[PDB]
Amino acid sequence: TRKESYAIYVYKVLKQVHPDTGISSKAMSIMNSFVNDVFERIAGEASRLAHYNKRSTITSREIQTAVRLLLPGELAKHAVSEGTKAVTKYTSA
Amino acid sequence: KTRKESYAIYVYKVLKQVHPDTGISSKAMSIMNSFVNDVFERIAGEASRLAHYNKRSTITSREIQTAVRLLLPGELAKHAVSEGTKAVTKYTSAK
Amino acid sequence: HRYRPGTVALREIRRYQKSTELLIRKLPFQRLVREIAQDFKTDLRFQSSAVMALQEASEAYLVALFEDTNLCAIHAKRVTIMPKDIQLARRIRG
Amino acid sequence: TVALREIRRYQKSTELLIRKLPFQRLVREIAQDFKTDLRFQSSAVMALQEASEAYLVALFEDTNLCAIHAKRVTIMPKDIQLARRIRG
Amino acid sequence: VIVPGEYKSKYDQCAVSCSFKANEGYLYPLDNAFFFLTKPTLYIPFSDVSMVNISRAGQTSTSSRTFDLEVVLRSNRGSTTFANISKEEQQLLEQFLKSKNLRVKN
Amino acid sequence: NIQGITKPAIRRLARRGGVKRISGLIYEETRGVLKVFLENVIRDAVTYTEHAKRKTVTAMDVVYALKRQGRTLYGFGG
Amino acid sequence: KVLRDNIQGITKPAIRRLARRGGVKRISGLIYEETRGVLKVFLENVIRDAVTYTEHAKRKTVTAMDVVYALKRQGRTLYGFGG
Amino acid sequence: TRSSRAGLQFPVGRVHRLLRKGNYAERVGAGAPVYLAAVLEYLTAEILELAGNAARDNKKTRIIPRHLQLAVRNDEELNKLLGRVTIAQGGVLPNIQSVLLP
Amino acid sequence: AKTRSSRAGLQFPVGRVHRLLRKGNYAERVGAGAPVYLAAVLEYLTAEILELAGNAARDNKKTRIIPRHLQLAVRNDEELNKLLGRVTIAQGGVLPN
Amino acid sequence: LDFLKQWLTDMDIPYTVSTINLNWATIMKSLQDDPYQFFLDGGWNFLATGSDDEASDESEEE
């Protein structure tokens, strides 16, 4: 059966951040549940913000404010910088 | 002005149904409306979560029944499921 | 008559437990809040009901924290609260 | 003195201190009250046990802190209810 | 010989469990004494029993093994407090105590 | 500013809490705690406003911020 | 059928090793039964929510997914089991 | 009308629309708004009766937030349902520790 | 290029994340700008935790990362400890103290 | 840590870095009983770990 896993991409991220390092299946499950949890947190915050400002569509602005709220300070700064760079490259392409 | 919807009319109706003499201040009514909205939001969040968890689009009465069974401390939950099952039976009877 | 130490304090405990009034003064607290909010966005205006909400939220937080502080002191077998108690309470709260 | 080590040995380890099968039987015992014929997943049993382990560990941390405030190096039960109530 | 009593505890049981010296053990009533098992095995004869008292708190958890019973023996000046008793156990013990006509302080 | 939350007022708060005797360092330390908690709430409130494209801190936004923090408030918002 | 003393299955050395992992130095005797009770209350809370999720699921097995979901309601989410 | 059909006070049709608008699901059950309106009405009834009893105790005929706070905090169940919530102007239950007393 | 994750250049799946937001009913219709930014955020967070975990593993000298390393990094780093304070990492253990 | 290491090198005192724990009590008692028994059983190199456990995983791919 197909299983919805971020693991395939998480392994790529792991090798880019640290080439020689490997991962146990247990830690890999930790990361899969981590990505699911953070995704649900940010997406839920964006949905509430869309309802709160009465917008019917989530957008990059909602996601970045959701990041600003949920993340603490330093990760919030670096995450918003990386994310705005990411939407910037995507749009410029 | 804009049309702003609050549940105050129904809160006030129920307040007569239970204690006819007593009235409700506007501030306490705002508190009660906030409580009603929060309770509905919590129950709806849990019910939608259950439907998503179990791969069921439709929010049928069973989903909200589980939500009431979960969110509330149980000694209100037993009542709340009871009146609601009664209500669904009544609505099925009527058309 | 000269009240013995502590009795008037107990009287105030009963008094302000009965009362349902704001125990921090509105304009000093509003000035304080505005001073904090200078950092995040300068020249920011406040809805007055919003300021009231910040105030009562802070009151609830400090009241519960003083309850925990007093519990810590009574656990410490000391009637007078000390800062030690406040750190202990917040550290348990986490 | 071995008591002082005995803090520091188990702190490193990732082992689950509560023995596996008595926890399984406890979990099924609690299950029986709410529903019977319930066939738990083994993964579910380990998931329960790990959370219980962490919760008790944090509780004992707060307990020892309460004792240190009291000038008592021994945890007393008053520390347990104090930590529970302040945590809420 | 001593025959076990015909007095039935909670759930038809013949004894009641409670903690002592950091150890859980049973109490068995009998014709002329209470026998507390098993470390240390303690006899409390009714004739030597001076009086008993009950201590209780007010909380929702009172229904779960909370009430306490303190007995005094005057011959040895020995006071023993019996912790961890629930509502039904306390009621059955008190019923036994009136039926035996022992002095219950309060 | 934070000094405006003065010793009589801290005593009044502590008496509402239950405290009978109060040490002197309590006032300064409590002032610090109030500073910290107010920062925590206000950051979320003003962030909510920057999303909203308003220049004022609305009480509804305050309620949403306190909801996010978990220290929910009822009555001063819908 | 019926089980008893399973909470007593939590052993005194297990409680002491827990307290030592948590940093405790000297342990009073009364700690053990109350820690047993605290563990007990936490377990009925978690198990009640999990079993409720399963009764919604129309399933006779309490999946680790439902366990995680109950813990998430309790606000003590765990990573590593299911997803 | 459906609210009369289900014999309830809180609005079944309004709850149905608002559930649809909330994006809780692609589909929203027919008895879902009925059941949810029943639950919400029961909760309002419980809180209102407890607050009214507290108001009679406090010698009032309108319920102020102090009555709501007193009801919620004194009732063990409602304290758990609304534990994190703080009621505006509600105050704290009078509770004073034993050692403090003379 | 052809695939959306490539047109962005993101590792985590832009297209799949779009599908998840669309199916989750988080809004009536999710915009096309949102999923790219979200996938970027998840990339950055996973990268941070993975770097810290590998660093802890290098102190331990073990090449593989284990949930002990994962929990050690999370608890020790103040910032990510605020992000995941309520979380418990399974078989993580407790830090020395 | 670097300052401590430089200071100890200046004092000319060999140092050890490790993570394991044993008593101080039993080592003191045994070494009063015989100052050389611990050098016989390997000296201060025993703190260095040679074989504690083995940990691994099957695989991680998809």
Residue numbers in the entry:
A (entry chain h): 29 to 121
B (entry chain d): 28 to 122
C (entry chain e): 39 to 132
D (entry chain a): 45 to 132
E (entry chain O): 369 to 474
F (entry chain f): 25 to 102
G (entry chain b): 20 to 102
H (entry chain c): 16 to 117
Kindly provide excerpts from the paper associated with this entry.
Efficient transcription of RNA polymerase II (Pol II) through nucleosomes requires the help of various factors. These results suggest that Pol II progression through a nucleosome activates Chd1, enables FACT binding and eventually triggers transfer of FACT together with histones to upstream DNA.
We employed single-particle cryo-EM to determine the structure of the complex at a nominal resolution of 3.1 Å, with densities for FACT at lower local resolutions. In this structure, four turns of nucleosomal DNA (SHL −7 to SHL −3) are unwrapped from the histone octamer, and the proximal H2A−H2B dimer is exposed. FACT embraces nucleosomal DNA near the dyad position at SHL +0.5 and contacts the template-strand DNA backbone with the middle domain of subunit Spt16 at SHL −0.5. In our second structure, FACT additionally binds the exposed proximal H2A−H2B dimer using the C-terminal region of Spt16, as observed previously. Comparison with our first structure shows that the C-terminal region of Spt16 has replaced Spt5N for H2A−H2B binding. In our structure, FACT only binds the partially unwrapped nucleosome, and does not interact with Pol II or Spt4/5, consistent with recent results that showed recruitment of FACT to transcribed nucleosomes, rather than the transcribing complex, in vivo.
